[PDB]
Amino acid sequence: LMNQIRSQLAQLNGSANALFILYYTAQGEPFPNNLEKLCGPNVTDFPPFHANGTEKAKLVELYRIVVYLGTSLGNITRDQKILNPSALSLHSKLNATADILRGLLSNVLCRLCSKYHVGHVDVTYGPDTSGKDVFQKKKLGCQLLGKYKQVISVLAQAF
């Protein structure tokens, strides 16, 4: 099992950066000429993560991240369907990633509730960005994807 997540974590990374470009690409003006300014990893309260922690703790965080991630993604997808109904290479990767993330949840969770004794886990989902101005919905959706690619690469070097 600890090898399957090592693997999902793997793929994810294989397509993280790629998905990020797909998003900022579909946004069109003015994201491509102002990327480092609106797509910079900046997710405020993004699940914390320490690398030197007992394998058990690193799963608690991974879990709370993957949940704050998948949730954050779903929002991006419900928003892109209306915003860029044509961006399909993107509409797909979005789901494509959501799926893979779902598996990691049940896996990191099975290693938790199982040998280890965790049972419940508290996370407090992130923000429910929806009442903001469209430009905001796109920027954050972009900021999340950037941070995702920025920390996911860090997550693979720890399991």
From Swiss-Prot:
Domain of life of the source: Eukaryota
Keywords, ordered alphabetically: Cytokine, Disulfide bond, Glycoprotein, Growth factor, Pharmaceutical, Secreted, Signal
The record lists glycosylation at 13, 42, 52, 75, 95
Per UniProt, subcellular location reads as: Secreted
Q: Name one GO cellular component term.
A: cytosol
Disulfide links within the chain: 39-142
A GO biological process of this protein is: macrophage differentiation
Q: Where does this protein chiefly localize?
A: secreted
| GO MF annotation terms | cytokine activity; growth factor activity; leukemia inhibitory factor receptor binding; signaling receptor binding
Give the protein's biological function. Answer: LIF has the capacity to induce terminal differentiation in leukemic cells. Its activities include the induction of hematopoietic differentiation in normal and myeloid leukemia cells, the induction of neuronal cell differentiation, and the stimulation of acute-phase protein synthesis in hepatocytes.
Entry's family note: Belongs to the LIF/OSM family.
Q: What is this protein called?
A: Leukemia inhibitory factor
UniProt organism field: Homo sapiens (Human)
The gene it comes from is LIF
